[PDB]
């Protein structure tokens, strides 16, 4: 009975999204296969057909714009948990962002968003250090090519993140070998090719009927049955009824279904939230329909104009300049060997019975105007800000939602004592062991290490990159030195800081000397004992 309900829900979402679906297929075929559609193909007359697009430089400069402004996701320490666990979580998030597949997914999805609007990569988890001894898992992200063709969001959800959705399908048109390996990496390979992964979120919503007493009110009457279990307790309590907080418990589930036959997998255990995270362009509802827009349609119309005028001009060019004459067959009855083009005769001979020619097409010379008319359309209808704010802020929303999903997966995974490498800010990699406590010093009471086990809020802060802020600081302090009297300790302190803020392999020894001195007059606090001995030997002097 489950199969037909799932199919009905999928069909409903399919129909609801089908407009944006066909429209995005048109867009991707435009931007990835050919710029000319069938619509112009039937409504056209030129013969020699050529498309010289200029949209691709535009999309390249746009994706460069999204590249030059990195987006970072932070983790709010909630439930009174220590900030350091959030710091460690940001460390894992960064060390998972620095991996190559992370850029692969991000770039593919953002490029599809620029052209189509939705690229929507998907989170994945897998075993690492392949050995039967360990069961530690890592978390990766898998991009979906033409995600608008293989990602079907729930129609009821009305969210940027689509996190309002309780379910989503992912179709997979597989070949024979495609069906084989696709099934075997998850399930049995018996075949009924359209296969799908119906993801789904189950939830548990109740009333919980909280009660109050003379003493502080503990949770009472969690369910409807509980009230019938406490019929005397509800009446004899100091306070009868105060609130009905509807606590909810939700769980995501993955199902492997097929269009024709029955589903191959019923429900699967994978994290807490949907591994799929969508990216949107300027997206909204217009008379209650999901609409999201990119830069393909407007630049597309401009490109169609420009390509049709250039092909018209080429059709003008594609002809022999020689004039084609008009005369009777009897008018050249004696002279047929001359009017052939293969020879050059001194004079043209004609019999008794001053002729007309065929008018070759000519340029209107007005085609210039419209040429750049188009040009202007394609190269500034799209852009000109410093960035198309909607694109990167939708990207930031996608980043933060990916943050909560990744945090949920990590919480659902990282319990066993593990050792992981943290990519700190400034890209400083560092190995940090997760847990197994190690006997306490103060109390000898376990105190599980780190224990990122918890509940944090993910939030991004788009703005000054670390490289940008450090360059600004270097320029600022350079100006300061340009406007600072010498001799004063501030001058030298700023000098040392400037050497500290420089590059690596080149000025590493001067930077180290500056750090040493900074620690030695006490401005910089010691973090390693050698600096402490340097401080004490300086201060005793």
């Amino acid at each position: 009975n489950r199969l037909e309900s799932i199919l009905s829900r999928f069909d409903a979402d399919w129909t609801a999204s089908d407009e944006a679906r066909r429209e995005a297929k048109n867009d991707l075929f435009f931007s990835r296969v050919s710029q000319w559609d069938d619509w112009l193909s039937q409504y056209t007359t030129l013969q020699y057909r050529g498309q010289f697009d200029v949209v691709r430089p535009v999309v390249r400069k746009l994706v460069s714009e999204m590249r030059q402004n990195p987006i970072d996701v932070l983790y709010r320490p909630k439930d009174g948990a220590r900030p350091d666990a959030a710091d460690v979580l940001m460390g894992m998030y960064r060390t998972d962002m620095r991996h190559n597949t992370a850029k692969i997914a991000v770039n593919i999805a953002v490029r599809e968003q620029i052209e189509a609007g939705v690229g929507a990569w998907r989170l994945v988890t897998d075993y690492e250090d392949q050995s039967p001894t360990s069961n530690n898992q890592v978390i990766r992200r898998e991009p979906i090519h033409s995600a608008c063709s293989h990602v079907i969001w729930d129609s009821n959800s009305k969210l940027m993140d689509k996190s309002d959705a309780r379910h989503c399908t992912v179709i997979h048109s597989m070949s024979q070998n495609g069906w084989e390996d696709f099934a075997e990496k998850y399930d049995l390979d018996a075949d009924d090719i359209q296969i799908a992964e119906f993801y789904e979120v189950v939830e548990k919503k109740e009333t919980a009927f909280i009660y109050q007493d003379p003493v502080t009110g503990e949770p009472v009457s969690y369910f409807k049955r509980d009230i019938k279990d406490v019929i005397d307790d509800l009446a004899d309590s100091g306070f009868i009824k105060i609130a009905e907080r509807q606590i909810k418990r939700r769980r995501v589930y993955k199902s492997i279904i097929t269009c024709t036959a029955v589903l191959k997998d019923k429900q699967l255990i994978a994290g807490e939230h949907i591994p799929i995270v969508p990216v949107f362009g300027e997206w909204g509802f217009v008379e209650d329909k999901e609409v999201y827009e990119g830069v393909v349609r407007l630049t597309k119309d401009g490109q169609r104009l420009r390509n049709m005028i250039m092909s018209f001009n080429a059709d003008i060019v594609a002809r022999t300049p020689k004039k084609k004459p008009f005369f009777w067959p009897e008018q050249i009855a004696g002279f047929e060997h001359m009017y052939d083009g293969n020879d050059d005769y001194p004079y043209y001979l004609l019999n008794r019975t001053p002729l007309a020619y065929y008018e070759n097409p000519e340029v209107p010379q007005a085609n210039a105007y419209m040429l750049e008319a188009a040009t202007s359309a394609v190269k500034e209808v799209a852009t000109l800000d410093l960035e198309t704010y909607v694109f990167q802020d939708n990207l930031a929303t996608a980043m933060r939602r990916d943050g909560e999903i990744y945090q949920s997966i990590v919480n659902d995974i990282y319990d066993v004592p593990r050792n992981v490498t943290i990519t700190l800010e400034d890209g400083s990699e560092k190995d940090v062991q997760l847990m197994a406590e190690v006997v306490d010093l103060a109390t000898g009471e376990k105190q599980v290490l780190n224990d990122i086990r918890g509940r944090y809020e993910c939030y991004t802060d788009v703005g000054p990159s670390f490289q940008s802020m450090k360059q600004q600081n270097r320029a600022e302090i350079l100006e300061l030195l340009g406007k600072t009297p010498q001799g004063t300790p501030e001058y030298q302190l700023l000098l040392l800081q400037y050497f500290t803020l420089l590059d690596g392999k080149g000025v590493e020894m001067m930077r180290d000397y500056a750090n040493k001195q900074l620690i030695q007059m006490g401005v910089k606090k010691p973090e390693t004992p050698e600096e402490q001995q340097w401080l004490v030997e300086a201060q005793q002097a």
Binding site: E19, S155, K158, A243, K289
Partner: protein, 162 residues
């Protein structure tokens, strides 16, 4: 710093039982003060034991070490009432001190559940009329491509919804 010099004094004495009990009572005093972290009190307690006999302060230490900080803050901050309590007899002085310490109260964790939870309910739309228009537009699209079977099924779905 005063805790540190009292620590030096305990170490000097150690290097006696009454002085010991008094100094652990003063250590709980300092723990309570650090919980309070009232800086002007640091002068208040020592001005207090300057004003009062050391035996009275020692008994205050012994009977209630952490409540001693609060009462000495009250008495130093209000030296007049400290003088009247000193004048009136010692046993009822202890009665008044205990009543003042209880006056400040402690751990009032009665109830923190809720206060008039309002109708905090969300909203939802499934865009069903938009879905009717959607079926109409798939009908229009199928008309263009000549997909007759899908066209007729879409027509039936359109006519089935009122």
């Amino acid at each position: 710093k005063r805790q540190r010099e009292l620590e030096q004094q305990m170490e000097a004495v150690k290097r006696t039982q009454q002085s010991a009990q008094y100094v652990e009572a003063a250590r709980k005093h300092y723990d309570a003060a650090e919980k309070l972290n009232i800086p002007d009190y640091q002068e208040k307690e020592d001005a207090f034991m300057q004003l009062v006999p050391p035996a009275v302060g020692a008994d205050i230490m012994r009977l209630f070490p952490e409540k001693s900080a609060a009462l000495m803050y009250h008495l130093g901050a209000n030296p007049e009432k400290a003088r009247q309590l000193l004048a009136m007899d010692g046993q009822s002085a202890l009665i008044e001190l205990t009543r003042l310490s209880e006056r400040l109260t402690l751990k009032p964790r009665g109830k923190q559940i809720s206060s008039a939870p309002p109708a905090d309910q969300p909203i939802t739309g499934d865009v069903s009329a938009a879905n009717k228009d959607a079926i109409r537009k798939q009908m229009d699209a199928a008309a263009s491509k000549g997909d007759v079977e899908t066209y007729r099924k879409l027509k039936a779905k359109l006519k089935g919804i009122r």
